Amino acid sequence: SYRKLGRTSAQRKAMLRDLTTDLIINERIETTETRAKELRSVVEKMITLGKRGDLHARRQAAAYIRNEVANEENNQDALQKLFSDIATRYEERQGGYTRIMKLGPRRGDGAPMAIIELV
Amino acid sequence: AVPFRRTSKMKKRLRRTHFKLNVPGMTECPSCGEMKLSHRVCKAC
Amino acid sequence: QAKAVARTVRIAPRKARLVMDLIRGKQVGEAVSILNLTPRAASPIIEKVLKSAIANAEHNYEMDANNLVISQAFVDEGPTLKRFRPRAMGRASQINKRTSHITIVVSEK
RNA sequence: UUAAGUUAGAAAGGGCGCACGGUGGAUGCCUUGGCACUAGGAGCCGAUGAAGGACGGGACGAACACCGAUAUGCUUCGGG
RNA sequence: GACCGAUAGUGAACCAGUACCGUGAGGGAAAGGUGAAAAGCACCCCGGAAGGGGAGUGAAAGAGAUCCUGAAACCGUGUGCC
RNA sequence: AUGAGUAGCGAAAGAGGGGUGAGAAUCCCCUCCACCGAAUGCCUAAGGUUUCCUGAGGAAGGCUCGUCCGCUCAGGGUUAGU
RNA sequence: UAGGCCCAGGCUCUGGGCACUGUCUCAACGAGAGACUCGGUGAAAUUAUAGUACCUGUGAAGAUGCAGGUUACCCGCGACAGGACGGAAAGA
RNA sequence: GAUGAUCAGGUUGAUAGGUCUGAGGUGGAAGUGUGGCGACACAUGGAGCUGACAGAUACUAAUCGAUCGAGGACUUAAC
């Protein structure tokens, strides 16, 4: 099935949306191991939506991506980055746009940490 | 639910026999000689 | 043989002995890696004591850092500090903040 | 080789003894303080402001002790 | 002083009628010991520090600041026999 | 000492990037997200008595941590004929 | 967020009818908090010592510890509530 | 499956995710065009969307490694 991640039904959705947008922005994220394991699927689905490029997929993506700035130099939205920069980079891959690398335990709570990045 | 009697030393030591830690699973980094957890990362290794 | 002791360390002895049992008897170079990769709160302290013992072995007795092994490794009890009123947030009484003396001895094999 | 018999050793941990430590302040030595008396003194202070205090005073923090805007001291007469 | 010697002797050998408790009258503790002399650890090493290991002082450093002696409960490490 | 590394550690929304630093889940900044709004807002009493500001700090204390604090230490700070 | 209706008598009480339902026939699934595992911290009641099986008897109250027999490799973790000479109780 | 445990796999491989194609569920998406004063209706068009289900596909992750684990006692008898 799917993990509940210790949240309620709405907080889980909010954290997933936030992490997806953050990974789109920064190209590489550090978070817990299970959060990355659950984030992989949604971020790959949104990359798949961006690879289409039509208006319908653009609005489906917009109904889930946060309103944040990718880079201030060109006044570029995260959605614009998704549909212009990444979709062009992964034009030949059939799936598997991410990779998780395990780091080790956190000091505060012993949680297992992991880096999730775009290939 | 009240301890009828104190616990002797020998019984305490016997109960504490499974309360111990495990040696970690460590491999040596191809480049470098650092040791990391298996399936963990260390290019900086 | 060389020794290094850490006195009145703010850690419960029973929790430090769990790691002390892991590392004793091992070669001194391998032991550091185990301490680095164990996720316990006594590891950093025991690692500092072990590094101090290794240092004394080279700067004071001119023994080599290789060919060194952990001979003795134990944890003793230190003076206990008594907090009589954890009434702050807690409803408990006379909490005991325990303490430890950590000792490590190394020698040549 | 087969069959039928005997025993040994094994320690995850534990028990007894021994060696070595930690903690904790009994014990032993010691005395700055007390207790019970003895022999002498002296048995009142105060509106010319008492007993007891508050606040202050040092080159530089707080406190004790000393002192009172002449404030960590003034004058005199003696001792040293 | 055929009186006590730090749980004793005053409640008080130590900044004690203090700290604390109570609205108040009032109740009322705990707590002595480095060394002959600070000569109280320059300097080197590990460590952010604390704390250690050398070096040095000292008769003694296992006399290093709750620093004379240091028992028992309690907590550990090694090992002979089961 | 035992119970025992046990019961606790209460609501209630956070996530990432950067910084500082020996060390970051917990401190600072940014971004988005979320909660109150006849209050969880503004002022001003009673009461408290320096808790206020700046720098330093990592003994102790803060139900975890701590580079942070109502904690510690040095300097400062309160102006009326209405 | 915010009352179930109607027909009665007696002044609020007793009614009656309807509506409605997990009250139950009889329970099933789902959400959260705790439980559980991992990292940090960390108490209390209680406590003669203890390597502390069961049955049938014996016995100053009711046998783990007395006699005779029957069973049982060493050490844990999670549950149950049987004993708990646990506490509540209360008759009396 | 509380945790241990059990079971399927670890790059001569389909273990899980992704992708592609399906199964089932909901039910006629966005944009555009048309009709209407308007709320709306029709066409494009069983359309769009789709967690835990199936088959292909090494695209991503199961890397490298480390540890443990025998050398088979004696007696008698039949061979």
Domain segments of chain B: what residues?
Answer: 2-45
Q: How many domains does chain A have?
A: 1
**Strand E at less than 7 A from CB of C13:** yes
A41 to chain C nearest CA, in Å?
30
**Strand H at less than 7 A from CB of A56:** yes
Please tell me which chains touch A, using 3 or more CB pairs under 8 Å as the contact test: B, C
Torsion of CA C33, C39, C45, C50, to 10 degrees: -20
Torsion of CA A83, A88, A94, A96, to 10 degrees: -70
To one decimal, the resolution in angstroms is 2.5
Contact check, Cβ <8 Å, A104/B39: no
Task: Assign residue B32 a region (left: φ > 0; alpha: ψ between -120 and 50; beta: otherwise).
Answer: left
C1-109 carries CATH number 3.40.30.10? no
Task: Assign residue C66 a region (left: φ > 0; alpha: ψ between -120 and 50; beta: otherwise).
Answer: beta
Smallest CA-to-CA distance from C23 within C13, C33, C10, C11 is with C33
Domain boundaries, chain C: 1-109
Residue-range definition of the domain harbouring residue A33: 1-119
**Strand F at less than 7 A from CB of A113:** no
Contact check, Cβ <8 Å, A115/B41: yes
